[PDB]
Amino acid sequence: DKATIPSESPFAAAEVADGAIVVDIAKMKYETPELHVKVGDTVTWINREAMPHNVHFVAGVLGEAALKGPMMKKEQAYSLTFTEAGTYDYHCTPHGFMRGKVVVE
Numbered sequence: 009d010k011a012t013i014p015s016e017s018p019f020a021a022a023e024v025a026d027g028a029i030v031v032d033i034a035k036m037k038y039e040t041p042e043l044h045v046k047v048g049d050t051v052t053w054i055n056r057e058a059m060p061h062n063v064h065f066v067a068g069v070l071g072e073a074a075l076k077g078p079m080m081k082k083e084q085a086y087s088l089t090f091t092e093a094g095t096y097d098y099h100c101t102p103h104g105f106m107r108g109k110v111v112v113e
């Protein structure tokens with residue numbers, strides 16, 4: 009696999025340390041749609057609105073299987089640690105027009 013999952017379930021935004029790497033989700037967009045990190049970094053999505061969203065990497069991207077994150081309600085967070093260099097696309101399962109990508113170097 010190319011990523012591990014710190015928490016299978018969504019968790020409180022407030023637990024995210026200031027300075028952590030964060031992709032915000034507001035107004036039906038991933039607010040940082042092309043994110044550059046380094047191998048080993050933890051990326052955290054935080055949902056800033058009431059419409060639930062997730063991040064969804066299709067089969068083959070982060071591993072054999074799809075990685076379909078849990079739906080996040082308002083002020084909930086979800087994280088993935090990227091363990092291998094490359095570029096990984098993802099979208100929001102119910103909102104397929106919402107697309108982003110992580111570039112791991």
Ligand SMILES: [Cu+2]
Pocket residue numbers: 060061062100101102103106
């Ligand atoms: Cu969504």
Ligand code: NA
Pocket residue numbers: 065066067068069070071072073074075
């Ligand atoms: Na995947």
Ligand code: NA
Pocket residue numbers: 013014015016017086087088
């Ligand atoms: Na997580």
